[PDB]
A paper describes a structure:
[name] is a phosphoglucomutase enzyme catalyzing the conversion of glucosamine-6-phosphate to glucosamine-1-phosphate, which is subsequently used to produce the essential peptidoglycan precursor UDP-N-acetyl-glucosamine. As part of the current study, we investigated how the activity the B. subtilis c-di-AMP cyclase [name] is regulated by [name], a phosphoglucomutase enzyme required for the synthesis of an essential peptidoglycan precursor.
Furthermore, in both complex structures, three complex molecules were obtained in the asymmetric unit and each complex was composed of a [name] dimer and a [name] dimer in the inactive dimer configuration. PDBePISA analysis revealed an average buried surface area of 996 Å2 in the interface between [name](1) and the [name] dimer, which was stabilized by four hydrogen bond and four ionic bond interactions between [name](1) and [name](1) and five hydrogen bond and three ionic bond interactions with [name](2). The active site in [name](2) was completely occluded upon interaction with the [name] dimer (dark blue [name] monomer with active site region highlighted in yellow) but the active site in [name](1) appeared at least partially exposed (light blue [name] monomer with active site region highlighted in green).
Residue numbers in the entry:
A (entry chain I): 107 to 252
B (entry chain A): 2 to 369
C (entry chain J): 107 to 253
D (entry chain B): 3 to 368
Write the structure that this text describes.
């Protein structure tokens, strides 16, 4: 319905940043209220579009130090800060972005997508579990599970 | 040259190239290039060296101690530094790096407003002031102090430039990149990605300690093996500061600066863009390079080693293309110093436009 | 009443892109309906803030070639295409961005701010007239189009 | 003699030279290197235009001896101390000169515990600044210092302050005067994220306008602003955000003694005031102690300067201390004077009692 869009935008944005190895951190809300984490970033409440998402995570920019938060089908805020998980199952030298993703996935039902600035591989975080190096259709099926 | 050698001020960091020395460099250089305009616009860039941060801090402290407006750029190639200093009409530009040298070494390099190395008179005055044991230079205070405008987005400007110098996107070309763990690490992987090419990366993971560490133009054997591993169409090996370029054909053989010069100048002649159909080069070039240049009816002017003489000749005679066997290629149509990524884009232009593989294009020039 | 908060964001964004060399084209709706031109870009309906605008007009990026249109204190859309001005009288200075800005000022009452990609000078277009070389506080005082 | 009361201070470039800041960073990093051969010094500044120059020189110095440096950007000195403690970091540096004019600046040091460096360490740092031989180690290659900017620390120090509020301040109109200093971005986020109607002023720094007719030392602008916007109260922090001066709805100034009285009285009403005592300086007003007796709160007096206030709170394990300046220490939460913490405690009192600021401040008669 209106789920095919926004989902299409997320996958297109993620493939765009993956081909260019642009670090990204996008947290999709479902049932747990994350307003306390939204109020830490730059509020946008913008309609979701691939171009806007790409523009948010440009290498060095005011709207890049932090995570994008998606509430409903709108980018509620950008450059939001998430807690670090300090877990040993995070493959080291990565962290920072991945640590924040798994940390926010430990506390909430949120689905967190990550794009590595070092490798360009797409990662996903849910319930404290981080799956690295996902394919385009793996992310597509995961985002249709939402 | 006391402090200003061929590649500016160089030394092993902290021990030889001390942060105090970098501070004096920034202060005295900003003063000498201040004289006319009240508040110069020096912008500064570096490679990924662990000493880069310390030297940048000292340099910005110096530049602000005489009122110069400072535009930090972060990690960006020396070509990008020159391009931004010119395209922004800024009084001077600084690159803290020491191309292809080991991580322990570093260096400060200066560019004028035109995008070229500072005039020897200015460097002479800078060294004159570094001998007086009295810092009798003005010490602005309050609002007279220097100003700082971080411009870490500058890369994408220099990126948007390179992107437009491609005759078309390179769709269907598999290219391996060796960025020496240097300044081009973030840039190149972005650039060829925006030109629709399947990039395969290596030496694109810097950590301040691994620059030019068995990777880069000086150590292309890793890329030679990697190209055969990923069966890519070609491999590109930039160096630390991204001013050189060394190619690798699909067979895994090295394609030095002479072969790339031949290929690109031949393509430019095929487009009529080669000015007077001449190519500037150094003594270091191979005999077969000039042989094939004659075979394709391309005149050539030779200068002494070092790219300041190559650019001197291209300057006075208004020549389009110049280069060295090192891979340092100057295309004066687009930039004023050697540009690894620009040279790579020209090579990709030739590849795409002729459809031949890199080995076949490089085989036209026979080395002696 | 709290529109000064929004002017603060606009002035900071424009002075930021002007201090460097970042091209910008910001239109702002007033009384004429600009939906015909809004529906040509990427819809955002976002809260304003300077950072979003600066991010919008960054090189290489997708929705940066074109103009963002500001509606009721919200960035309605970006990368919108504006009509170019067939009027002569100015062309000598290249145009393109300035031409597109001036074109919308005859058809609308909108106040369009422009940042030159070559000079970095701030320009404004209103009622078909294009004011060149604006100072930081001249634009700020100029932006009192709000009552 | 470089380390006065407020660390090393001077007018920038002319007296507090970047060479001097470099020597400070290098020798202090050596002094704080003795444990691990890579200390974790983190560094922050206010909005002073000399902040960038002094920070560059300081980071160059700290990296010239191998110290790992964590830049923080613009953040209050309280935030610096809180972050250095909460991060188990060896030291923290603040480039600022509280409430002084923009032309002046200064370097201040905090140990791992969050307190001013021990006088032995400062003595050694000054000892090394006298030998005309920079015979200290010059690490090279991989032995050099490392820097990983941590501009997010602010939001940590913010996330801390946010939890020290007994509830959100809904329905309270508050005017903020941040002196165009470090508290400009923080405070406006804080009280807005705590659901309070904020009206801002002096929250627009440009590196030249710090402490310019605004802040705790110049509260008349905020005094007029409170009556203009008919706010319930106005809060005036200073340049580095360590002091606080309140303004009631009537427009009157509420100095540090009145704020100490109000907050200690509320804390006693919550039983959180340790031993029902309050530490203060000679500079405090007689009526402050009078009302302290009237509310059954004991009091300890120390010499002027906050090192003695915190000395007393240290040895005797006391909860609250302060000065008439507005420099208030709540040792339950922080180790130096904290403008925003004091403001949060005052807002706690306001919300919990519902009374206006004038009525709360009238209990203590000057």
């Amino acid at each position: 319905e209106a789920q095919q869009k926004t989902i299409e935008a997320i996958t297109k944005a993620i493939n765009y940043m993956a081909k260019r190895r642009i670090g990204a951190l996008l947290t999709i809300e479902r049932d747990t209220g994350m307003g306390d984490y939204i109020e830490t970033g730059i509020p946008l409440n913008a309609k979701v579009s691939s171009e806007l998402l790409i523009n948010i995570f440009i290498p060095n920019t005011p709207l890049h130090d932090g995570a994008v938060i998606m509430k409903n089908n709108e980018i509620a805020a950008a450059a939001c800060y998430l807690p670090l998980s300090e877990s040993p199952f995070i493959s080291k030298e990565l962290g920072t972005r991945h640590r924040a993703a798994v940390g926010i996935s430990e506390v909430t039902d949120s689905l967190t997508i990550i794009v590595s600035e070092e490798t360009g591989g797409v990662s996903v975080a849910k319930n404290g579990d981080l799956h690295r190096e996902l394919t385009e259709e793996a992310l597509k099926e995961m985002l249709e599970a939402e | 040259g006391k402090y200003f050698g061929t590649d500016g001020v160089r030394g092993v960091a902290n021990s030889e190239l001390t942060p105090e020395l970098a501070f004096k460099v920034g202060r005295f250089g900003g003063y000498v290039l201040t004289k006319d305009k009240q508040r110069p616009k020096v912008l500064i860039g570096r490679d990924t060296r662990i000493s880069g941060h310390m030297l940048e801090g000292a340099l910005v402290a110096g530049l602000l101690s005489i009122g110069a407006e400072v535009m930090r750029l972060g990690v960006i190639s020396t070509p990008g530094v020159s391009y931004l200093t010119k395209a922004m009409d800024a009084e001077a530009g600084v690159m803290i790096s020491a191309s292809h040298n080991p991580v322990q070494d570093n260096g400060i390099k200066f560019f004028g407003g035109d995008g070229f190395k500072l005039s020897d008179e200015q460097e002479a005055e800078i060294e004159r002031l570094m001998d007086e044991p009295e810092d009798k230079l003005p010490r602005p205070v309050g609002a007279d102090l220097g100003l700082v405008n971080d411009y870490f987005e500058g890369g994408q400007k220099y990126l948007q430039f390179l992107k437009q110098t491609a005759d078309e996107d390179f769709t269907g070309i598999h290219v391996a990149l060796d960025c020496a763990n240097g300044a081009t690490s973030s840039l190149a992987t972005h650039l060829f990605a925006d030109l629709d090419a399947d990039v395969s990366t290596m030496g694109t993971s810097p950590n301040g300690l691994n620059i030019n560490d068995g990777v880069g133009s000086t150590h292309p054997e890793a890329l030679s093996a990697f190209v055969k591993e990923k069966n890519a169409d070609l491999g590109l090996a930039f160096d630390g500061d991204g001013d050189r370029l060394i190619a690798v054909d699909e067979k895994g053989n090295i394609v030095d600066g002479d072969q790339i010069m031949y290929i690109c100048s031949k393509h430019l002649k095929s487009e009529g863009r080669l000015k007077d159909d001449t190519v500037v080069s150094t003594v270091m070039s191979n005999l077969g390079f000039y042989k094939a240049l004659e075979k394709e009816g391309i005149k050539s002017v030779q200068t002494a080693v070092g790219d300041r003489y190559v650019v001197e000749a291209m300057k006075k005679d208004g020549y389009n293309v110049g280069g060295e066997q090192s891979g340092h290629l100057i295309f004066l149509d687009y930039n004023t110093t050697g540009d690894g990524l620009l040279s790579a884009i020209m090579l990709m232009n030739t590849l795409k436009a002729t459809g031949k593989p890199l080995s076949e294009l490089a085989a036209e020039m026979q080395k002696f």
